Write a protein that binds this ligand. Structure first.
Ligand SMILES: c1cc2c3cnc(Nc4ccc(N5CCNCC5)cn4)nc3n(C3CCCC3)c2cn1
Lengths: 256, 244
């Protein structure tokens, strides 16, 4: 092990190659609910080898070690040091694509990744998206019970805050928030409580009418991103676009 | 605790049914039930499965916790030998694991031990099943198919809550029986709906009007569908707590 890259997520080499890997030495009711969920999903879907989801290599066991592929940096470090004027125009269009791609993946396998944050999203040297930390992730069957605590404060979709039942649109919320943060290299919504947070939001999207209840350039964006971003932050979650419907939207048609 | 409601992405997207069909092919079809087994038998399973189901029913767990535990258990019992004694430790670990995955409030070690081996032996047995399967624990459960099959069948969306409750229940009890363990998740599920629609007389078509389309949808013959219905209804009917 060398230098920590996550609060505990290490970084080391191996006896096979001194190649780069990420180590997650999980400190252990038996095995923590979350890591069992995380791994279970990742091994379930792994043979599909999707471009946009980190690979896992092994597990072993008192202490526990969880071994992944290494990535250059998290999108957090990226945005915090990308030469002015920050992430370029089209690099932005591109990572939005891969994000919505690895998330079109996921949802189609009835999986929801409800912990979408730039701390979690990864970026390989070649500038490719790798989604990580699948602790809060699980298969969505129907009529199944739900905790009331997913996503870090700043990326939490409304309806979650409103203590309603969530679903997939929870992923698209954070997306149209990371879409936002990317342009303006700082978190778009920075509350302090579930109620402050619902405010920072509600004093932007505006007052949802009686039907949707259980300036935006204001906050350097294309005319087209600003329909996508509005589509991913429509209050009503049965109105929020789907990653599939979004991948096809006009903001994207000009692309590598 | 609030419940997952309809989600077009996750239930009405046609490629969800497709991908279920696919990942269904990632659990290699069992040759015979518990082949690798020298001591315990299928008889020993219907019992333990019956306790397990009850344990899942009595503690009000999500409908998809018992299919996963049955899946885990069988799988573990291809790659490891188990005694007639430990056979209960094992099945109690499967519920421990399966709950942690598919349900928001897991069974605990206390609840699983206080009524049954020690609090450590069980944990070590969670370990042993975790290793043996190399932590590849999730699976495609017969339960996963109900709603996508309801969408596919153009069943009026508002009949889904009752049908989900009825059929997932009929399904889970069948899964106790041996001969249901061979059938493919999609098919076990199709039987569920038909066995159910027949019974309740839900405002659908009559069930035979879903046979030729469930054929189309799952890609089996209208005979395999009928047999899978019959087989399932029968396995339902074979439920008996006094077997314990
Ligand atoms: C599985 C695999 C990974 C993984 C693989 N590579 C990297 N690479 C990486 C990230 C960040 C940094 N920086 C170092 C200086 N401080 C700022 C950040 C450098 N390298 N991070 C990974 N994570 C992280 C998600 C959030 C926490 C752990 C994973 C989580 N699960």
């Amino acid at each position: 092990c060398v230098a920590e890259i996550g609060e505990k997520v290490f970084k080391a080499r191996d006896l096979k190659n001194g190649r780069f890997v990420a180590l997650k030495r999980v400190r252990v009711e038996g095995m923590p609910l979350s890591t069992i969920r995380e791994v279970a999903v990742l091994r379930h879907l792994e043979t599909f080898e999707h471009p946009n989801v980190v690979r896992l290599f092994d597990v072993c066991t008192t202490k526990l070690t969880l071994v992944f592929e290494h990535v250059d940096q998290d999108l957090t470090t990226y945005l915090d040091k990308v030469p002015e004027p920050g992430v370029p125009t089209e690099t932005i269009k591109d990572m939005m694509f891969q994000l919505l791609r690895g998330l079109d993946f996921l949802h189609s396998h009835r999986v929801v990744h409800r912990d979408l944050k730039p701390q979690n999203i990864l970026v390989t040297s070649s500038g490719q998206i790798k989604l990580a930390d699948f602790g809060l992730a699980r298969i969505y069957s129907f009529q199944m019970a739900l905790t009331s605590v997913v996503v870090t404060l700043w990326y939490r979709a409304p309806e979650v805050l409103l203590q309603s039942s969530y679903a997939t649109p929870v992923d698209l919320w954070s997306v149209g928030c990371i879409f936002a943060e990317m342009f303006r290299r700082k978190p778009l919504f920075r509350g302090s409580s579930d109620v402050d947070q619902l405010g920072k939001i509600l004093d932007v999207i505006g007052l949802p009418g009686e039907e949707d209840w259980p300036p935006i350039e204001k906050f350097d964006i294309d005319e087209l991103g600003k329909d996508l971003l509005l589509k991913c932050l429509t209050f009503n979650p049965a109105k929020r676009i789907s990653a599939y419907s979004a991948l096809s939207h006009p903001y994207f048609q000009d692309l590598e | 605790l609030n419940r997952a409601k309809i989600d077009s992405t996750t239930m009405k997207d046609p490629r969800v049914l497709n991908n279920l069909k696919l990942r269904e092919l990632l659990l290699p079809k069992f040759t015979s039930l518990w082949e690798i087994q020298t001591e315990v038998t299928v008889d020993n399973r219907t019992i333990l499965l019956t306790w397990m189901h009850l344990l899942c029913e009595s503690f009000e767990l999500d409908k998809s916790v018992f299919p996963l535990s049955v899946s885990i258990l069988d799988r573990y019992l291809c790659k490891k030998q188990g005694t007639k004694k430990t056979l209960q430790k094992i099945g109690a670990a499967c519920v421990l694991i399966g709950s942690k995955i598919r349900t928001v409030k897991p069974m605990t070690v206390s609840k699983l031990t206080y009524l049954s081996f020690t609090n450590l032996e069980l944990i070590n047995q969670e370990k042993d099943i975790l290793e043996a399967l190399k932590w590849d624990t999730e699976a495609v459960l017969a339960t996963d198919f109900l709603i996508p099959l309801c969408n596919a069948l153009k069943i009026p969306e508002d009949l889904w809550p009752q049908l989900y409750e009825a059929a997932s229940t009929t399904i889970c009890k069948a899964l106790i029986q041996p001969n249901i363990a061979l059938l493919s998740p999609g098919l076990i599920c199709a039987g569920g709906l038909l066995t159910t629609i027949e019974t309740d007389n839900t405002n659908c078509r009559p069930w035979t009007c879903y046979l030729e389309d469930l054929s189309s949808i799952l890609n089996f013959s209208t005979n395999t569908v009928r047999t899978v219905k019959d087989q399932v209804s029968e396995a339902f009917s074979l439920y008996d707590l006094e077997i314990l």
